[PDB]
Design a binder for this molecule. Structure first.
Ligand SMILES: CCc1nnc(NCc2ccc3[nH]ccc3c2)s1
Length: 224
């Protein structure tokens, strides 16, 4: 399959990304609590449902929530202000809450069954969100003595996600909380790392890790 791109809603961020986030790729966004990672996730869950002329892929979405932060009301707001029908947009998001890191891993296997079911339809899965990818792994494997096993489980989880992205032509989008009092970047595992932070006057700033884009959080999700 060719590489598809999903617009983020921000022309600034799209330019930094070369057009949007890529299918057949894992995009990892990391930053402090409150930097706006979940707002970018909510916006992408709407954008992917637009036609390609508007930066979408006419796609379905699968969302794995580890922290109870998915907000259907926010999806409705973004959809309404992107000229879509909010009921239709929500109908094409499949949502699940991961109870712990082992259940989170099983949900990715279940995701593959639904991906196969929609593969040959007019609304194939094009976006798989894991928000937040590391939180259960961090809370369940505390202490230096457990770090080796934590890394083992995380590496298998990421390999599973890599496989789905490439095999089924899906954009995988994962968030990761990293700050002074806790958090670890996903080493070299993601296809692409995006650092997100707050700036003066409520602006958000994005940089590619291994220019900068600037945008706001609005009723449209994010925008310049
Ligand atoms: C934990 C209870 C649920 N079981 N399923 C749900 N919603 C549908 C569903 C099923 C599998 C999934 N894999 C990733 C997202 C996703 C969504 S909610």
């Amino acid at each position: 399959a060719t590489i598809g791109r999903i617009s983020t809603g921000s022309k600034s961020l799209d330019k930094l990304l070369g057009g949007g986030i890529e299918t057949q790729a894992i995009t990892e966004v990391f930053g402090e609590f409150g930097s706006g990672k979940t707002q970018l996730a909510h916006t992408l869950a709407v954008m992917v449902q637009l036609p390609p002329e508007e930066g979408g892929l006419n796609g379905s979405v699968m969302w794995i929530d580890t922290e109870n932060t998915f907000r259907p009301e926010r999806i409705r707001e973004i959809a309404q202000n992107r000229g879509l029908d909010p009921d239709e947009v929500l109908k094409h998001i499949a949502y699940a809450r991961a109870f712990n890191s082992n259940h989170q891993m099983l949900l990715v296997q279940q995701a593959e069954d639904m991906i196969k079911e929609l593969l040959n339809t007019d609304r194939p899965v094009k976006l798989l969100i894991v928000d937040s990818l590391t939180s259960h792994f961090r809370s369940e494997y505390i202490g230096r003595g457990a770090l080796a096993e934590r890394q083992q489980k995380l590496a298998k989880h990421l390999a599973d996600l890599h496989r789905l992205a490439n095999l089924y032509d899906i954009a995988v989008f994962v968030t990761n909380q990293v700050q002074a009092n806790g958090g670890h970047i996903l080493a070299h595992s993601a296809t692409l790392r995006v650092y997100l932070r707050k700036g003066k006057g409520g602006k958000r700033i994005a940089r590619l890790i291994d220019g900068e884009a600037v945008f706001s959080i609005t009723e449209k999700g994010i925008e310049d």
